[PDB]
Amino acid sequence: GSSGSSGEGDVNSAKVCAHITNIPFSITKMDVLQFLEGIPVDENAVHVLVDNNGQGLGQALVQFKNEDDARKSERLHRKKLNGREAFVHVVTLEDMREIEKNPPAQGKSGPSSG
């Protein structure tokens, strides 16, 4: 879908990130790396979140090089991890950087604020 003739070039607003939510804070980056078994990604590519206690709110942001790896990571959407449903949303790097620094305010994926 051309989506309007603008002009290709340097990665601009490209989907090269995937946010994983609805996961148990019991697991750590290490475990997460196992869930993505099959895709060629580095450990530093996945940034796990943490809270005052460290456990974390149960979320992580993955950063891939190109969509070639993203389109594949998004294929595991709505997957079961440790007996818990997981939601993977694809977003542009920019969005990832913003979130990583300042996580969601309200949150929609899973029960965050009762």
Side-chain angles (χ1 to χ4, degrees):
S2 69
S3 301
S5 56
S6 290
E8 277 197 306
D10 302 313
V11 178
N12 176 307
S13 288
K15 276 151 275 78
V16 301
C17 283
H19 188 222
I20 311 168
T21 61
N22 197 312
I23 50 171
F25 40 89
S26 82
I27 76 173
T28 57
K29 192 188 71 175
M30 285 277 168
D31 289 299
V32 175
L33 295 179
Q34 186 80 14
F35 166 46
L36 298 163
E37 172 174 272
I39 307 170
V41 63
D42 197 277
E43 310 165 14
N44 297 78
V46 181
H47 295 208
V48 179
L49 281 176
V50 292
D51 200 34
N52 187 348
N53 311 111
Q55 289 277 95
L57 321 87
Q59 300 170 208
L61 290 164
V62 191
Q63 182 197 332
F64 300 110
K65 298 191 273 83
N66 284 315
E67 298 194 36
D68 313 319
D69 290 86
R71 87 90 196 178
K72 300 162 90 279
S73 76
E74 65 73 52
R75 176 183 164 79
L76 296 171
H77 178 55
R78 289 159 67 82
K79 271 279 183 301
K80 293 180 174 279
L81 195 194
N82 272 19
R84 270 201 197 287
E85 297 89 64
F87 294 89
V88 186
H89 285 85
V90 169
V91 299
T92 59
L93 179 58
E94 207 83 70
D95 206 69
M96 185 284 236
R97 209 89 78 82
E98 271 89 287
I99 299 171
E100 192 288 326
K101 292 197 287 277
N102 201 313
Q106 279 162 12
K108 183 86 77 181
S109 274
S112 181
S113 200

